[PDB]
Write a protein that binds this ligand. Structure first.
Ligand SMILES: OC[C@H]1O[C@@H](O)[C@H](O)[C@@H](O)[C@H]1O
Ligand SMILES: OC[C@H]1O[C@@H](O)[C@H](O)[C@@H](O)[C@H]1O
Ligand SMILES: [Ca+2]
Ligand SMILES: [Ca+2]
Ligand SMILES: [Ca+2]
Ligand SMILES: [Ca+2]
Ligand SMILES: [Cl-]
Lengths: 112, 111
């Protein structure tokens, strides 16, 4: 099964990726609501998910460039505000928000 | 318990910080079955969450609990040189005490 673990510190997505890969894992990418809730259980605050629309705007893929199916966007999201929001975080209510990849949040890693 | 190995080598302090970052700890085998599981996740020599930094020749886990199960390689522990207060799991599954300042892979443990 997949196991999820949350970081203690906040960091931008690239450092988040590096953290998870250090232990040979990836940044958590929920494929359904059960997994979304399992990530909620470990995330004590807003945290990064392994999803971005960095390739093509409004097309969300996991970190391996694989287009995602399941989404749980917060109302009004994704909205790509300002200079752009191409990363995704799981809010404390379990819904997602697109955010700048350079902003810092906790990170949930996934292993299997 | 779930065990994960790092890809890079680092001294024990950095090793502890890494596992703690994801709210886990440096792996401490409590029996032969756990020892094997950690050995398998580690592709090379890796630190275990055991030291005798507090009291020489008194090996305990990172929370100060004296370890019962041990799997020392023959001749170990030997505290050579100016001291070896950290512990690594060799590629043959046996343990060796080493300087905490030396770099090895790290296997983290999670519950
Ligand atoms: O900077 C704060 C903003 O962040 C955006 O990502 C979000 O869509 C907005 O609703 C607002 O929360
Ligand atoms: O530095 C090399 C030495 O490392 C020690 O920890 C070990 O006990 C010795 O047998 C030798 O391998
Ligand atoms: Ca975007
Ligand atoms: Ca947004
Ligand atoms: Ca010693
Ligand atoms: Ca030794
Ligand atoms: Cl030492």
């Amino acid at each position: 099964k997949k196991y999820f673990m949350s970081s203690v510190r906040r960091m931008p997505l690239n450092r988040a990726k590096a953290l998870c890969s250090e232990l040979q894992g990836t940044v958590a990418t929920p494929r359904n609501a059960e997994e979304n809730r399992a990530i909620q259980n470990v995330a004590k605050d807003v945290a990064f998910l392994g999803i971005t629309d960095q390739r093509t705007e409004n097309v969300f893929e996991d970190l391996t460039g694989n287009r995602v199916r399941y989404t749980n966007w917060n109302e009004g999201e994704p909205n790509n505000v300002g200079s752009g929001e191409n990363c995704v975080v799981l809010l404390t209510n379990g819904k997602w928000n697109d955010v700048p990849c350079s902003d810092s949040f906790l990170v949930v890693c996934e292993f299997s």
